[PDB]
């Protein structure tokens, strides 16, 4: 009766903080946290060698807007969110391609387990 899913995310109702009612293991699980290397982007502050390791490179506005704020270890956890925000940008805007062999032709360097998940 429950398979055919809900639109509501996996929340935390008994939590009192808004960053606590959205748990970090809901959107991205605790196994996929260590399949991403974190020093490939923060060590090189560059205009091309930071945009090179993004899943969906584009000439847009919001993509390179929140990236150029700071190089601080506080946003180290939220650095993989932007890496996973841009990977979800490729899925929703494509409705005619129904395979993975043509998914490379719109992207450049997609992730390994984050794409198949």
């Amino acid at each position: 009766d429950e398979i055919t899913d809900r639109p509501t995310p996996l929340a935390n109702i008994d939590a009192t903080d808004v960053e606590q009612i959205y748990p970090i293991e809901s959107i991205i699980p605790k196994k996929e946290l260590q399949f991403i290397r974190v020093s490939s982007i923060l060590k090189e502050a560059d205009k091309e060698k930071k945009l090179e390791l993004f899943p969906y490179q584009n000439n847009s506005k919001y993509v390179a807007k929140k990236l150029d704020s700071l190089t601080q270890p506080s946003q180290m956890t939220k650095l993989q969110l932007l890496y996973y925000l841009s990977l979800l940008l490729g899925v929703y805007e494509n409705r005619r391609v129904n395979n993975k062999t043509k998914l490379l032709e719109r992207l450049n360097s997609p992730p390994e387990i984050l794409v198949d998940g």
Partner: protein, 45 residues
């Protein structure tokens, strides 16, 4: 734009308009601050 606001209503955010305090430092004019919404949340639920 209203196709986007309807997605947040399942979450439960009270998507309301901006203020004149939230008008000067955001690049939008002070008179046309009605079509420009700001979505916050409430901490118990």
């Amino acid at each position: 734009p209203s196709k986007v606001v309807s997605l947040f209503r399942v979450l439960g955010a009270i998507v309301k308009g901006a203020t004149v305090a939230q008008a000067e430092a955001f690049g939008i004019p002070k008179s046309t601050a009605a079509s420009y919404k700001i979505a916050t949340m409430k901490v118990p639920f």
